[PDB]
């Protein structure tokens, strides 16, 4: 099955992400962008009652701290 | 410094992922999401002829294949 889902991932001051998929009313934690991916498309795929679910694309805005 | 900036990723068939920040003229690519991130905060840090970059957060809409 196909579905998108609009989601918002912050970075806290540890450098750890929270994620949020509000169509899902979900919220997932990790230490690694790695990390994160993974819970997040396992969350996603209970949140569907499906067996597991992958991450195929994202289209968004990245906000980006330089020096 | 600050900045946000547009972002398209995609995962082709060997599941291995390509970024592409169309306001940096820039594509980047990595064969997991963690190496895709590294490399692309790397990219962005040259873009802006700065010495590092962090994605502090990104706010979009994830594709999802689940079965």
Do not use: C, K
């Not at 949020?20 to 979900?26: K, M, S």
């Not at 990790?30 to 991916?37: P, W």
């Amino acid at each position: 099955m196909r579905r998108r889902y609009r989601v918002v991932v912050e970075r806290d001051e540890e450098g750890y992400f929270v994620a949020h998929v509000p169509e899902l009313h979900a919220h997932t934690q990790a230490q690694s962008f790695e990390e994160l991916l993974r819970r997040l498309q396992e969350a996603i795929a209970v949140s569907l009652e499906e067996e597991r679910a992958e991450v195929v694309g994202l289209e968004g805005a990245l906000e980006i701290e330089a020096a």
